[PDB]
């Protein structure tokens, strides 16, 4: 796992195999992305224009089998620059500034042809934040899907509710779900396959 | 449509794509100007302020046209791919009342069909400056957005127009009608014509 | 000639001979003369004014144009004009002697290269500037300048020669702005100051305006 | 030698030598043993404080360094040290877990590496952080806790180990009575190995 | 001749066949001599509580590297040039608080005697003493700038005729002085000095 040559090998290897603007699928089947969301924070919430700013760890793995190699005698996982490698076009459908990432933009590569990215994100959503003083709380519901690939190409998942969630928040955390969805729209006659993350929350009493 | 997760098969359309694709150049067949496709569906509404007259708004842009010159036969092949816009030749459209940059919010992708059709469908929240008064009263306020082709006239790009499904159920404020209409003027500086699609939209607050 | 404008295989010629010519860090000098460079400003909107800190928001439409007939070609059977990233040209280095921000370019940068080596490049650009916002509330109006010159050139190798005058300044300007444009106007400048012995040409532009209503 | 330092060709070549050795995507791991970075936080100024959000902006001096005996070189007769742009260099991915804002790097992004190897790059920052602010107001002070740790590496990769008025202002609204720096490893239930991290309890209060 | 355009592309090659943009041009085995002087165009804003100040100034960088120097008996005297062309100094302010902002471009004059001028004008939030703004006397705020990467063997700061000069005459404050010093600190961490160039301003508001 410690040798520097090792790992620059390993890294050259990738780098020539890795198509990155091209969908790793395996025969004829969609890739399968595995997304979770862990939150981390809450640190705006407005009630008038339904809005709230968060920070969550966003975890995505998916398999690109072509990038395996046998490790008996090599390191098990690498960190690859993103740059040099397909990584999925998620997107949340709610959100109504852009991502901003916190953390640096690697993901490791396991020698199975296992790739996890998992990325520290703040961004501001649009949701219904009706009942957040409440003791039953409010529910913002966040959906986070392939933009430009449709159920046949991308095929997305979901993979303990405050486990890394600050304890120096203004809110807390009651319960967070993930639900997988089909769906179409009037425009493209082809499905779209989100996650539907459902945050439980309320202001601290 | 069966064979549509070759890797290779994919890998093989990009290459050709990238080949034929001439990212600066207007993609015309036959002498004919570049019909493009343009319009809106409105997703949000974050910022009104009647005093100043603007408007921040979250809207899908639906931007299509056709370039011949990278048709393939999808027969046993994939019938679509997704592509890098910085690969393609895109359509330099601009808000003509827009007052901040244009922010977008989703990966910046075409997809590129096999007929030869290409689909940019952005979403972009951005800040324009319009007539807000009305509303707070029951037939609203209209609020016109004008986008046409920076630098190219009528003579080489025309812009085309082809109920809010999309939009949010959280927003303050409530749609009531879109319509979507084709202008082409003639500015004192240039002996051209400019062409462009007005989007207005009747939309007032809830309660 | 219009009749051949959009050959798909002649323009991307075009493009082509451009990039082998073009130097895009050299000035286009032509014999012993300074480049004339034509500046003209209409405005779009005027965004937000403070009478207490002295600023103003403006988004104005920025028309630049020069020439480089190193660029020319024969149009009798080819496009008349064409569009070109700015990366690829020399573009003047124009400064606003009184901005405060950064400017914030709202559209697509391309500029237009017309047959006879005539460049034009016309962003529309929102900036903030320091300038006297005192009788904006009055029904004279207030009186805001602008200086924009030429940053690291001097007069014998960029002159700006001024673009003015209007009709007609109230036309690109936003009706559904807090604000009305009474007059613009331009001058033509040219400044000697401590550090160098050369000259730098700028163009000082005035926009009285008032509240409205 | 202090002597060599001065020369213009000198310097070239060693950077040459560092851009064709240097892999900056690879970890510069030696023997088998885990790279050892050494952080270090000093502050420079405390300046947005909310107490109801409990959120805090800092600028802080952060001091990193490593060592990578394959850039070394003998300097005998050639000079000791030189400054490099960190795109041609292997740095550390650090990150605080704690910090709400993209960190903003004040100064200009060179590093010094050292003819025995050692690389320093110490970059001074400005970040917004969520913290307990509370007490900030009275005599014993806030204690807030940053912790900056390894994002992608675990500990047999990387391993940081730890190690205050001296560089804080004097026109800052608020003042420094302790600041401590422990190393921790932890293990998230996502992954099986540990991460290392280094919490920085910093101990602070508004004037008067 | 200094319009020669054939003459300019000719001397801008020879300068990037030169010219190493990241290593410092020493010669004769001395430190560089960089020069330094700030001239105040504004002061945006002022807070008393915080001690914060937002200023636009203009950076006035010089230095030479004679393997960059040509003879102009009949090419032109001076050319401007990208500055990632070039070397170009890593100073820093000690006591800023923000990324700084540059206004204008980034374009450096390089003149046939080998001399290096960058004169960038700047917008940035410094912390400093600001009591006394609103008194006659004045508040007195230092700005510390110095070269960051490298010590004073390496580099060398030596800063260069009235203020109010440049200064927007639309302030609301007023400029009562500004004077330059030279100072040379070792800190704890390394054992080689560093030299920065402390710039006081004496400023009070204005009746
Ligand atoms: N997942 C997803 N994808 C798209 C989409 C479809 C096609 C294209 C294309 F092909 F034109 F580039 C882009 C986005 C659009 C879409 N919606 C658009 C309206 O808001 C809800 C989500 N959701
Ligand atoms: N569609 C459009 N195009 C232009 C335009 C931009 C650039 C150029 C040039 F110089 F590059 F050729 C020409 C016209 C200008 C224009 N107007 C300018 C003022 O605002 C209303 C719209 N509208
Ligand atoms: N047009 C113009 N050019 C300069 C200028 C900029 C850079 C350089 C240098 F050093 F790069 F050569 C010289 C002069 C400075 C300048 N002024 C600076 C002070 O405010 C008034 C404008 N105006
Ligand atoms: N040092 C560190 N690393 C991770 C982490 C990041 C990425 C990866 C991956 F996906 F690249 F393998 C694994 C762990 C997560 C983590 N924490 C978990 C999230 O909350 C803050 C602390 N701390
Ligand atoms: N001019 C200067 N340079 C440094 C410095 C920067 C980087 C490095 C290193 F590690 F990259 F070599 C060393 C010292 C530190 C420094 N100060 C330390 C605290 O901030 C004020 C002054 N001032
Ligand atoms: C893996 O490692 C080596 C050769 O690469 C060898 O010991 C072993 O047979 C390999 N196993 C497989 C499944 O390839
Ligand atoms: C499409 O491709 C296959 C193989 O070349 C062929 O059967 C079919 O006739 C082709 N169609 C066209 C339009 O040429
Ligand atoms: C362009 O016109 C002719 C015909 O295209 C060409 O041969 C010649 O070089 C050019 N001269 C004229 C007539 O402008
Ligand atoms: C380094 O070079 C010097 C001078 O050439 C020589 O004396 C020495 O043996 C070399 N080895 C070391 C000390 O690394
Ligand atoms: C330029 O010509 C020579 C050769 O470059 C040079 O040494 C001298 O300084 C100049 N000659 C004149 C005419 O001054």
Do not use: G, L
């Given at each position: 796992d410690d040798d520097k040559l090792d790992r620059a090998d390993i890294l050259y290897n990738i780098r020539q195999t890795s198509?990155?603007?091209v969908i790793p699928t395996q025969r004829d089947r969609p890739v399968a992305v595995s997304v979770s969301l862990k939150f981390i924070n809450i640190l705006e919430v407005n009630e008038i224009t339904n809005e709230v700013d968060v920070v969550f760890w966003q975890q995505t793995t998916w398999s690109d089998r072509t990038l395996a190699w046998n490790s008996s005698h090599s390191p098990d996982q690498v960190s690859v620059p993103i740059s040099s490698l397909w990584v999925p076009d998620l997107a949340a459908y709610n959100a109504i500034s852009k991502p901003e990432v916190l953390t640096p933009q690697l993901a490791r590569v396991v020698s199975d042809g296992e790739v996890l990215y998992m990325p520290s994100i703040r961004q501001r959503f649009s949701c219904d934040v009706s009942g957040?003083?409440?003791?039953?709380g409010a529910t913002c519901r966040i959906k986070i899907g392939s933009?430009?690939?449709?159920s046949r190409e991308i095929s997305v998942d979901p993979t303990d509710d405050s486990e890394?969630?600050?304890?120096?928040?203004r809110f807390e955390i009651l319960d967070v779900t993930q639900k997988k969805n089909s769906v179409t729209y009037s425009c493209c006659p082809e499905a779209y396959e989100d996650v539907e993350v459902s945050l439980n929350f309320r202001k601290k009493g």
């Open positions: 198509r990155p603007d957040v003083d409440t003791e039953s933009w430009t690939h449709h890394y969630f600050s304890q120096y928040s």
